[PDB]
From a paper:
Despite the co-crystallization experiments were performed with GalNAc-T2, UDP and Mn+2, we obtained binary complexes with glycopeptides MUC5AC-Cys13 and MUC5AC-3-13 (the binary complexes are referred to the enzyme complexed to the different glycopeptides MUC5AC-Cys13 and MUC5AC-3-13, respectively), and a ternary complex with MUC5AC-13 (the ternary complex is referred to the enzyme bound to UDP and the glycopeptide MUC5AC-13). Interestingly, MUC5AC-13 was bound to an active form of GalNAc-T2, whereas MUC5AC-Cys13 and MUC5AC-3-13 were unpredictably trapped bound to the inactive form of GalNAc-T2. In these cases, the flexible loop was found in an open conformation, different from the one previously described for the GalNAc-T2-UDP complex (PDB entry 2FFV14 and root-mean-square deviation (RMSD) of 4.68 Å for aligned Cα atoms corresponding to the flexible loop; Fig. 1c,d), which further demonstrates the loop versatility. MUC5AC-13 as well as MUC5AC-Cys13 and MUC5AC-3-13 glycopeptides have a C-terminal GalNAc moiety that establishes interactions with the lectin domain-binding site. Although the N-terminal of MUC5AC-13 is covered by the flexible loop, the N-termini of MUC5AC-Cys13 and MUC5AC-3-13 are exposed to the solvent and inserted into the sugar nucleotide-binding site. The latter two glycopeptides adopt very similar binding modes, although some differences stand out towards the N-terminus (RMSD of 0.72 Å for aligned Cα atoms corresponding to residues Gly1-Ser5). The Gly1–Ser5 interactions with GalNAc-T2 are mainly governed by common hydrogen bonds with Glu334, Arg362 and Lys363, and distinct ones in particular for Asp224 and Tyr367. For the diglycosylated peptide, an unprecedented GalNAc-binding site, formed by aromatic residues such as Phe280, Tyr367 and Phe377, is found.
Numbering used by the authors:
A (entry chain A): 75 to 569
B (entry chain B): 0 to 15
Write the structure that this text describes.
């Protein structure tokens, strides 16, 4: 019973402002000082393609229940999310906004917003996690279509109608906006490159893939066409409520930590639906990572329960490429999965090989006799061709997790191979630069082996190790094997 | 509830 323009933002943010000396980034990994400076209804630029302005929608699009789950969100950001939905959406299409407070420290963060028109608050009595919280919200939802948003988002002009139009036409489409960037430091709202879509490597964390030449050519042909995507990050999407329920909601055995990308993306595609990015729908999001999760590290274990629950149900034998990338996950308890395996059987879903061939053929699968695969990492750097060809030197370069010049395998024949080129010891004197040369099956100069717990790369039949100490002076070398940081190299997958 | 921290949409600044 307060209309949103009459909500007192100043009093709400209130005593939760950052005191001088307190870390502005402590509450939620973005600058709360800058978030608190903004008005709840602050103007943002219209990042849509100009062709999006030429669209008109029927008044009878199905209304949605917007479900926003949160845990210790910054009050200013939570309010601005809610206001953006209310300000930018035709009111008839917002049946309700359900805030699911997942046991935040202060119940007032959510409760005070319940005074706003259309906003209902459900508070969990313990921290349940995003997926269980979303099931609670979806169960409470009165509308025929569910919209899931995160708690630090800002909806743009006519963001909702394009999403609802897709789902009304075909209930098996699960659709997402193009996600614009709200800068974590200065809160400016900007658009990212149009040539990026969701993806993942074998470690199973969400990443952005650069579109292939074919995908980019297609996009240029119609920059406002819906784009099929192999994976959503899992934060923002719209789904017909009955389809959500029929397909198995979310797995209620998921915990708080991660994996919200995985299970739903695999299940929707394998069980006959699709995922889409809708370019005329724009929602900004406060992205919070500098650098997206890196392995090895503790992330592999932190996200393992939820990740294994997806992998063990959906991925068939391809789960073993995940365990090759994330060996720390192999023995992490993940709970019983018989209910979800029964669901998979009941729904007559396709195998994971079908997903890889038809939905994500860009994900490179190791050859069946590869010894190791992926990128060859040293700190945050990667073995890199530097765009060279035969007779060229090789280098190190910051790992960009985009494949390309950083894509390698240690083959059955013990070669370190990129396309048709192999690392070649052209000169055995210590200190000599190695070169790319065409792969030749019985060239002893092209044979390498992992040593010291798969932490170094030794040239077979020698006491020479791959060494980056020469990088500044021209490229990678062979050097007498020794206890050197510059001789540490590890493939992302050991098979 | 929360999502995990999401990566800013970026990729390599060179071409393969
Ligand atoms: C956060 O990280 C998890 C790790 O399991 C997933 O990659 C998830 O997709 C990420 N969430 C968002 C919103 O990017
Ligand atoms: C782009 O070129 C640089 C060297 O200039 C690196 O080789 C980098 O790995 C390349 N990017 C991709 C995606 O291959």
């Amino acid at each position: 019973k307060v209309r949103w323009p009459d909500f007192n933002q100043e009093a709400y943010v209130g005593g939760t402002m950052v005191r001088s000396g307190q870390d502005p980034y402590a509450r939620n990994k973005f600058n709360q000082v800058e978030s608190d400076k903004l008005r709840m209804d602050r103007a943002i630029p219209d990042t849509r393609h100009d062709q999006c302005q030429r669209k008109q929608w029927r008044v009878d699009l199905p209304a949605t229940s917007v479900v926003i789950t949160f845990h210790n969100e910054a009050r200013s950001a939570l309010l601005r999310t809610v206001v953006s939905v209310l300000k930018k959406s035709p009111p008839h299409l917002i049946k309700e906004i359900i805030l699911v407070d997942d046991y935040s420290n202060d119940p007032e963060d959510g409760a005070l917003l319940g005074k706003i028109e259309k906003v209902r608050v459900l508070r969990n009595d313990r921290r349940e996690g995003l997926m269980r919280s979303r099931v609670r919200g979806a169960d409470a939802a009165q509308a025929k279509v569910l919209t899931f948003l995160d708690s630090h988002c800002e909806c743009n002009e006519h963001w909702l109608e394009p999403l609802l139009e897709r789902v009304a036409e075909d209930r098996t489409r699960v659709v997402s906006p193009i996600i614009d960037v709200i800068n974590m430091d200065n809160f400016q709202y900007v658009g990212a490159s149009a040539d990026l879509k969701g993806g993942f490597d074998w470690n199973l964390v969400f990443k952005w893939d650069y579109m292939t030449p074919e995908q980019r050519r297609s996009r240029q042909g119609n920059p406002v066409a819906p784009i099929k995507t192999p994976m959503i990050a899992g934060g923002l999407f719209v789904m017909d409520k009955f389809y959500f329920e029929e397909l198995g909601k979310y797995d209620m055995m998921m915990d708080v930590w991660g994996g919200e990308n995985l299970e739903i993306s695999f299940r929707v595609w394998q069980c006959g639906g699709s995922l889409e990015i809708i370019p005329c729908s724009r929602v900004g999001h406060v992205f919070r990572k500098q650098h997206p999760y890196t392995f090895p590290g503790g992330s592999g274990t932190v996200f393992a329960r939820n990740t294994r629950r997806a992998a063990e149900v959906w991925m068939d034998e391809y789960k073993n490429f995940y365990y090759a990338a994330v060996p720390s996950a192999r023995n992490v308890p993940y709970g019983n999965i018989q209910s979800r395996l029964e669901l998979r059987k009941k729904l007559s879903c396709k195998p994971f090989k079908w997903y890889l061939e038809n939905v994500y053929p860009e994900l490179r699968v190791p050859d069946h006799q590869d010894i190791a695969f992926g990128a060859l990492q040293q700190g945050t750097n990667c073995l890199d061709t530097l765009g060279h060809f035969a007779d060229g030197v090789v280098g190190v370069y910051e790992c960009h997790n985009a494949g390309g010049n950083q894509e390698w395998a240690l083959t059955k024949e013990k070669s370190v191979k990129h396309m048709d080129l192999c690392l070649t010891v052209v000169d055995r004197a210590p200190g000599s630069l190695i070169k790319l040369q065409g792969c030749r099956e019985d060239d002893s100069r092209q044979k390498w082996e992992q040593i010291e717990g798969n932490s170094k790369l030794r040239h077979v039949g020698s006491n020479l190790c791959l060494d980056s100490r020469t990088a500044k002076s021209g490229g990678l070398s062979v050097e007498v094997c020794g206890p050197a940081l510059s001789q540490q190299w590890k493939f992302t997958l050991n098979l | 509830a929360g999502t995990t921290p999401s990566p800013v949409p970026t990729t390599s600044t060179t071409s393969a």
